[PDB]
Amino acid sequence: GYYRKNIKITVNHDSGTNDPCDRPPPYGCAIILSENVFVPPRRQRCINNLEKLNVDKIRDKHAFLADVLLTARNEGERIVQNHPDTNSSNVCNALERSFADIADIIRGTDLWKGNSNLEQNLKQMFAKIRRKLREDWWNANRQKVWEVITCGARSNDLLIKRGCRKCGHYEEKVTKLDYVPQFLRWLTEWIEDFYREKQNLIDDMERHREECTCSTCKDKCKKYCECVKKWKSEWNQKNKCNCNESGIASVEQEQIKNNKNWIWKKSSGKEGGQKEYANTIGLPPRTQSLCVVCLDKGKKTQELKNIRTNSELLKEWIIAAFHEGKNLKPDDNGKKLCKALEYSFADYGDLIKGTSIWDNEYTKDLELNLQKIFGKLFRKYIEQDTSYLDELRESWWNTNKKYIWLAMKHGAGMNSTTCSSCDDIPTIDLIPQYLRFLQEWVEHFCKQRQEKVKPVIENCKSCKECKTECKNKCEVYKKFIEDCKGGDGTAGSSWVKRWDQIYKRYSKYIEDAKRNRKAGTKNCGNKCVQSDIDSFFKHLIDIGLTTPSSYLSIVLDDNICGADKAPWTTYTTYTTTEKCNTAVVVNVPSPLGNTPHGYKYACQCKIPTNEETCDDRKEYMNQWSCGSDNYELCKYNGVDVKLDDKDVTFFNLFEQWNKEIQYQIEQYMTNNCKEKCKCYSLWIEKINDQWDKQKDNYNKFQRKQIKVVSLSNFLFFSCWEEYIQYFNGDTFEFLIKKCGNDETIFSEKLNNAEKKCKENESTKIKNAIQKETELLYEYHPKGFCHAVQRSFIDYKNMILGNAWWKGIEGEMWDAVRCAITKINKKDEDQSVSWFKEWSEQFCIERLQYEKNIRDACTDKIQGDCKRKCEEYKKYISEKKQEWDKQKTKYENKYVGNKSLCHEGNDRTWSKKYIKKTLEGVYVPPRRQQLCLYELFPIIIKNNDITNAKKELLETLQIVAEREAYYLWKQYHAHNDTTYLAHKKACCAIRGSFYDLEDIIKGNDLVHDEYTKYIDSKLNEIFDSSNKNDIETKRARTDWWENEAIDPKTIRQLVWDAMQSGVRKAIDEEKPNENFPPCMGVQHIGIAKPQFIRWLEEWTNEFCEKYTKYFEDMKSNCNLSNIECKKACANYTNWLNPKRIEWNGMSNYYNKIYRKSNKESEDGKDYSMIMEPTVIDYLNKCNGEINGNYICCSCKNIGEYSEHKMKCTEVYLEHVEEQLKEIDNAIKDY
């Protein structure tokens, strides 16, 4: 609900900026040593937020619902964190009592609270919506209110629901039915409070009377007796070792019977389970058969509920563990029994300390009895060393985990010296139960997979007809892997779906642990990460194990899942043939693959073809299907076909093919060698066949149309258009050099590709040259190739006044080598080389002048420093004088807190600077025009580490401010000033801030000179006397999101700098604008990966451009050769680069999703994105722009068969007139 609020189904916060819950000591019968408002309980509230409900948003009941749910959520959190009962049933009862209290508040039937001016506030809303209606409203929203109130309840909370888990949060029926009048409810809560106070006083004097002596306790009991009598008098108003002595709190420190089957459903009536963990993790068969009912399989000897001392509790637990040991009695004791005992011991641990995620209709009773026992036993422990109930359970388990382990060992026959019993206690119990269940399930699946794959690997390894050697066994393996029935591992589903559910739950843990800014990891109490799920997953994120794939790769054994090395990291792709229906491509880890790893196109009894190897090498791809009097269409693999229609469709396909093939050839010109150019020559043959087919097709087009320009004319037009669309809107010679003048160009390009393969696969004056080399050596060496090439080319130019020149050049290497041996005894190359030598000389001279001016300079500095500054300025001016001429000559040869920075609306953007593998990454223009000018001075200073950090923080602040100001000014400089422009500028500012964060954290994909110098200097700055890449990349990270420096860390500090910049933008440029709600949220979530943000920005920009262009065409065209052609050319010109960019981005995204830091490329997280394809991810763009959670607002893409004929026919006319312009373009020169 868009309200001072953001977009709130699970937990609110968010309609709370108006009035807080404060007025107020939380209430958790006052003790006496030796008003008539007694009817209301101890808890008087939680109410102030709902109080004075007269905000302008009262015409909609949804605002009232949001406010009441916020109040209920805050009340529930207060009760959960407040009520000191150490009993989940009592906490649930208190939550239900508060729910009934707010029920009577909203219904307003029996409202008796000592607040003023509340009933009128409620009646205002209930008359705007317009007391029976109030009751109907409550009976309608009861379910939602009870869902929101118990959100903060602990996971191991029990509800009696007499009329269960987590205070009845998950019941699909409100649970307790409190329709009773609050008079009896308050009386019941009062008597409960008195009884609880009596037991509290008993617990107090248990450690007081026995130690201090007595009489004072009896006096207090007497006083409470008269207090109770005084209360009841007014009640005419009724008519209206081996124990917990040690106390060890272990801290984690980790570095890099009946029928039983795997149950995955929710907690059923009597078998398996929790509701939250349903259909996302499977109970192992052992975990359901833990022998507490194992007293004698029932109770005949002695009742469980007789634990007077914790010694009895330990005895009972020891007996249970010992009887568990005998259940696994049938070497196995090193790999099977040891692991089984480890998992059973961890299960006991995680069910004693209230971490179990499974239910067996005895776990409820066991948990309730354990809570009662711990409450009645340990009271003094529940000055923060002796005093801690969950921490009490964890400490008790850690103090007595050794005896349970020994008991189960002696019960399994595993007596001693096995898996003096030195360091025998497992560390497995520390990791969360979900990870243990995942590992057990995966190792079971591996056992089955190895059993089913051993015949395959032992049969057709020679091929790494065929009756049953390998055709049949691989069929059995495929049936095992691909079957909707699943198998023993699953519970009625395919392995892929179960793995997807596991991945979803693991990613939910990863995101939940990453969002919690609470200290988590790195809390010294060495590292000493505390015993919590969030801390453990923070540690896993710090390692990089952010996916089940990599985690299982690093925790599982080796050669456990098959004789073929099937890694859990290398994802493999396959097309399903079973129901798992439609042929959907699936990417899964190698053990879950369709066929054994490395046996693709080798199990079908076929030699691996070179074409297949190139097709599965993911390199040198030409995505063109080449399906075919009729036109031999070069149909694309992705989309299929949907003046006549045939020739125009062929023309569009031919134009797209021409553009994409030219781009691919140019890229491969820009871009072990044996198979490399085997695939390269295959690609060359494919594109040559495509070119021949397209030549034939264009001949057919010309002979059938009857005119259209010739083929060469169309290619010349294409060359001109691709030149114009960098030089939008010298050049003459460059165009002559690139393409011809008044079809051969592809012949030359393919010849160039072939010779590039050949080169790659293969790989007096005559004395004056050595004299000059010796002289230059004696001058000093660095960069001698430039000197020798310049001298030789100059001498050649003088002597000449074409293999002969090449022969002379190649013959004189021997002279240079002879000169080298003698001294041991004791882009073109005419102006570009001169430019590079001049640049190197300038760089060296300027670096020397840097220290020359830094000598006596480092407030304003005068004296000697001004002389050096004046000389440096004179040198800079003199060098720039020649730099202008050098740049002009280079371009003529070929073109291919204030601050001094520019503001430039550039709409085109392609890949030019990426670290690179990194294929299909295109940097958005907003990030390309990022202002890092002011960031260079502050780190040129190279002086003190603390001063360097302070100055870097200041410069980051000013850069963020200027970037935000320019972004807001640039977006609103147009005619539009509505809310849409505000949201667009908000999203752009957020993206820029994320890009700054990634540059600081060193995760940016850009690799140009700016970021190169920035991260090169920052690596030196953030070196803590060590050169570890991980250590420095985490030291530059914790300075950002963990350096508090009232505590306003660097992230919110830079965000406030952006806010100040946008306020400066607002406060300068209808009569009075206000601060947008998005900009003032002051809360920023975890940033999505750089590529994903870039992809969303591309989608938003492309959708906006399509909406603008298509609407323009719908008016100009569809009734004309000077106005409709403009829209036609505008729409066609920008589509092809978008086609190429989308193809590259999709190709990249196909190898990103479901990857971790280790198994992916460039070592980025990339784990949170899990959608199958790029379209399936961008589909989850729907909706308008709002704040941060949504940035893309694409809509109305499909619903164009119309405006095709007219757009193409004018395009041909546009080509003819441009080629007629040759009369004044190339004819005269």
Residue numbers in the entry: 43 to 45, 47 to 50, 52 to 57, 59 to 68, 70 to 74, 81 to 86, 93 to 103, 105 to 173, ...
Paper text:
VAR2CSA encoded by a subfamily of var genes from Plasmodium falciparum (P. falciparum) named as var2csa, plays a vital role in the cytoadherence of infected erythrocytes to the placenta. In this study, the VAR2CSA ectodomain from P. falciparum strain 3D7 (~306 kDa, containing six Duffy-binding-like (DBL) domains, N-terminal sequence (NTS), and multiple inter-domains (IDs))8 was recombinantly expressed and purified using the Sf9 insect cell secretory system. The cryo-EM structures of VAR2CSA ectodomain and its complex with CSA were determined at a resolution of 3.6 Å and 3.4 Å, respectively. In line with the previously proposed model, our structures showed that the core region is well-defined and covers NTS, DBL1X, DBL2X, ID2a, ID2b, DBL3X, ID3, and DBL4ε.
However, DBL5ε and DBL6ε formed a flexible wing region. As for the core region, DBL2X and DBL4ε stacked closely with ID2a, ID2b, and ID3, and formed the most stable core center, which served as a base for anchoring DBL3X and DBL1X at the top or bottom sites, respectively. First, the individual structures of four DBL domains (DBL1X, DBL2X, DBL3X, and DBL4ɛ) in the core region are quite similar to each other, with the typical “3 + 2” helix bundle shared. Uniquely, our structural study showed that CSA binding induced significant conformational changes to secure ligand binding, which was not reported by these two works.
